[PDB]
Write a protein that binds this ligand. Structure first.
Ligand SMILES: *CCC(=O)Nc1cccc(N(C(=O)OCc2ccc(F)cc2)c2ccnc(Nc3ccn(C)n3)n2)c1
Length: 304
């Protein structure tokens, strides 16, 4: 009852692309921003390149496996790998970085229409991961990337695990995890809903750290004690009551991603009835460095 994963893994010559600037250095590797210029095709494709540095290659290649198996407007997909001495993952460049940082660097210009539309898009992406039976296990506003202020995508599948047709792990992010995942290291699609709740909360609070100033070990108890994160100031009880349901302890009485889409979509139809924000404002649109006449976004570059 398990279908054959016929995704293509595309191997790309290191010649076809040019690094341009370090986006980040995490010791395991370095992520560059560059251009991908396929050979004799007259397109430049803005990309991010992550090269490892180990026996950590099993990790970077597992991520490429996941990222090559996902095709959705609200998930990041792998463009290809390059098998140089350093193995390199290539993906679409998300020009505006992660949502977490974006929400902080722009609090004074983020309206309710944006916040609620983001909540819909993350839910759509997560629901699609559900369809493909994938459990993210690391949903957080920092693992949501911003292609335009109007358009975000879920990212970071390092931890991600494909279920069959209830994943048992054994380094984690505790403040975003369902109770089950703390105590039993179980991860479900409903485990992802809990983390989704925390992510919505990050966005409403414009990037506050969940349980700031609390030591991680205590968190399991205070959650069993019936405690949760505070109602955000911009948040009507309508919004916050959705957040709170994501944090119920019976994981099956939590909401499904397809329901979070409907609910937040209904709210995004009348944003100011649901989020109260002083002065509901506008947000930006990018050639940057090199002659850019033939630049094509990854989402418009489809070799089948
Ligand atoms: C909110 C947390 C955060 O800042 N994350 C962050 C910082 C810097 C760079 C990125 N990446 C990234 O992690 O990509 C890794 C990767 C995985 C798989 C693959 F095939 C290639 C690369 C990232 C990815 C895509 N686009 C951007 N863009 C970006 C980031 C910061 N700025 C200004 N632009 N980053 C994530």
């Amino acid at each position: 009852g398990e279908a054959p994963n016929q995704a293509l893994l595309r191997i790309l010559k290191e010649t076809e692309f040019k690094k341009i600037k370090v986006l980040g250095s995490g010791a395991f590797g370095t992520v560059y921003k560059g251009l991908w210029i396929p050979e004799g095709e007259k397109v430049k494709i803005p990309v991010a390149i992550k090269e490892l540095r180990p026996k950590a290659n099993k990790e970077i290649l597992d991520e490429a496996y996941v990222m090559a198996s996902v095709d959705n407007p609200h998930v990041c997909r792998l463009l290809g790998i390059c098998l140089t001495s350093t193995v390199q993952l290539i993906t679409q460049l998300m020009p505006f970085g992660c949502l977490l940082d974006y929400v902080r660097e722009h609090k004074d210009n983020i309206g309710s229409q944006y916040l609620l539309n983001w909540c819909v898009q993350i839910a759509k992406g997560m629901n699609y991961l559900e369809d493909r039976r994938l459990v993210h296990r690391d949903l957080a506003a920092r693992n949501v990337l911003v292609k335009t202020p109007q358009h975000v995508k879920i990212t970071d599948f390092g931890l991600a695990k494909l279920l069959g047709a209830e994943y048992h792990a054994e380094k984690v992010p505790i403040k975003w995890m369902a109770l089950e995942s703390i105590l039993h290291r179980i991860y479900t699609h409903q485990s992802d809903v809990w983390s989704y709740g925390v992510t919505v909360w990050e966005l409403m609070t414009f990037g506050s750290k969940p349980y700031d100033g609390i030591p991680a070990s205590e968190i399991s108890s205070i959650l069993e004690k019936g405690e949760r994160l505070p109602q955000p100031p911009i948040c009507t009880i309508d919004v916050y009551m959705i957040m709170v349901k994501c944090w119920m302890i019976d994981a099956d009485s939590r909401p499904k991603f397809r329901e979070l889409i409907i609910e937040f979509s209904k709210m995004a139809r009348d944003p100011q009835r649901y989020l109260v924000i002083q002065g509901d404002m506008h947000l930006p649109s990018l050639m940057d460095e090199e002659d850019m006449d033939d630049v094509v976004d990854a989402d418009e570059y489809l070799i089948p």
